[PDB]
């Protein structure tokens, strides 16, 4: 099965420009037509444009076509979204997906993978990692043989973080909750994971914060306190 | 463009109940020649692209369970979610590739309706790295409830903040149905070291009575 891989999260100035890259796994763009899906928050799913790299033609919306331009790299099966003089309304998830027309010419393959998606954030904030701080299990976070411990994300700019723990050995009870923009114009989140009560002296309990925009990686460990 | 107009925008029902979405749109998506229908059903759940459902306006994608099921032709299409089970907890869009330019429907955000379930009330107080800096956060944790309707309130030494904390609600979780909520209370160390109790009071459907969780400094 053909997988496509996106470019990282990216903050970017008013008025820049930016590019969003899209691997098409294969080895070969064949006769797909490789689409741009914008999710903005409160807007749905949009339609942008799609690309066929093969015949070097591309179609848009109306709301993008005079602001985006759609490239490809077939040296390396590189799918590019060129966006122009964003503003604060393009913060959006970015998805690349092979998705096709009746109209133009799909060759078949009207659907296919989708890209993990690419969060851009339109913003002059700087770049800021995270502080990282244990949320420390106690009596007070305990209810019989179930108790909460977590990581306290804090002041980061812009999203996301990911956050694992045991790196990725802990799954089950983990919620990682939406990040709340603050009162300072950071972004704040908390991890929390439910553990049985009697593990809490003996099994150890790490969270794993990335933070890609800033490259901060940054492992705590949560004891109790 | 052919608009799709999706119904309903939110939908709560019951594990095991049959949940019906419905879209029309503008203009026929239907080829003459072959009598296919280019209308596809995506799911979306937290955190992951879309995931094609259906096809061809009732062709079922191959891993999809066969509970899911599209219907309609032309301009009218369904989406039929049978016995419906936790991991059914997702956004619906419909979607047209007739014509260009694409056009999804708005999405039909799916939420299941279980028992209701009180929270576990914890309480963390602030690290001391943290208080190694100005700033000091307090964390309310409301864990595993439904419904989503919760009431967090903070009292420092009794007096009712407002102002100086946000909360955070998780996606609907796919396994037990539940939310878990977080209320972080932040004081600068100055003005948390003035004070000895912190107070976070929950009021819930599945509680009792308003339950109160506390710690002193």
């Known amino acids: 099965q053909v997988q496509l891989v996106q470019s990282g999260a990216e903050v970017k100035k008013p008025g820049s420009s930016v590019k969003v890259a899209c691997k098409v796994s294969g080895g070969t763009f064949s006769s797909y037509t490789i689409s741009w899906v914008r999710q903005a928050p409160g807007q749905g799913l949009e339609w942008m444009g799609g690309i066929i790299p093969s015949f070097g033609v591309g179609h848009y919306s109306q709301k993008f076509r005079d602001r985006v331009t759609l490239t490809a790299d077939k040296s390396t099966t590189t799918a590019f979204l060129e966006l122009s003089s964003v503003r604060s309304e393009d913060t959006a998830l970015y998805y690349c997906?092979?998705?096709?027309?009746?109209?133009?010419?799909?060759?078949?393959?009207?659907?296919?993978?989708w890209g993990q998606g690419t969060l851009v954030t339109v913003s002059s904030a700087s770049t800021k990692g995270p502080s990282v701080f244990p949320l420390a299990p106690s009596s007070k976070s305990t209810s019989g043989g179930t108790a909460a411990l977590g990581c306290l994300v804090k002041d980061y700019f812009p999203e996301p973080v990911t956050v694992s723990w045991n790196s990725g050995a802990l799954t089950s009870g983990v919620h990682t909750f939406p990040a709340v923009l603050q009162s300072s114009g950071l972004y704040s989140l908390s991890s929390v994971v439910t553990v049985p009560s009697s593990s809490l002296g003996t099994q150890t309990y790490i969270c794993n914060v990335n933070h890609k925009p800033s490259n901060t990686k940054v492992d705590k460990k949560v004891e109790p306190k | 463009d052919i608009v799709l107009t999706q119904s309903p925008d939110s939908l709560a029902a019951s594990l095991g109940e049959r949940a019906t979405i419905s879209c029309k749109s503008s203009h026929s998506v239907l080829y003459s020649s072959n009598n296919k229908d280019f209308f596809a059903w995506y799911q979306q759940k937290p955190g992951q692209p879309p995931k094609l459902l259906i096809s061809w306006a009732s062709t079922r994608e191959s891993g999809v369970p066969v509970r899911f099921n599209g219907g309609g032709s032309g301009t009218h299409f369904t989406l039929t979610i049978s016995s419906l089970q936790a991991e059914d907890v997702a956004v619906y869009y419909c979607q047209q590739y007739f014509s260009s330019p694409i056009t999804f429907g708005q999405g039909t955000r799916l939420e299941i309706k279980r028992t209701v379930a009180a929270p576990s009330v914890f309480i963390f107080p602030p690290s001391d790295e943290q208080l190694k800096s100005g700033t000091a956060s307090v964390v309310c944790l409301l864990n595993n409830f439904y419904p989503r309707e919760a009431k967090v309130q903070w009292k420092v030494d009794n007096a009712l903040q407002s102002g100086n904390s946000q909360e955070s609600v998780t996606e609907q979780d796919s396994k037990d149905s539940t939310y878990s909520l977080s209320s972080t209370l932040t004081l600068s160390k100055a003005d948390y070291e003035k004070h000895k109790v912190y107070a976070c009071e929950v009021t819930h459907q599945g509680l009792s009575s308003p339950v109160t969780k506390s710690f002193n400094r």
């Open positions: 997906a092979i998705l096709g027309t009746f109209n133009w010419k799909s060759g078949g393959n009207y659907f296919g993978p």
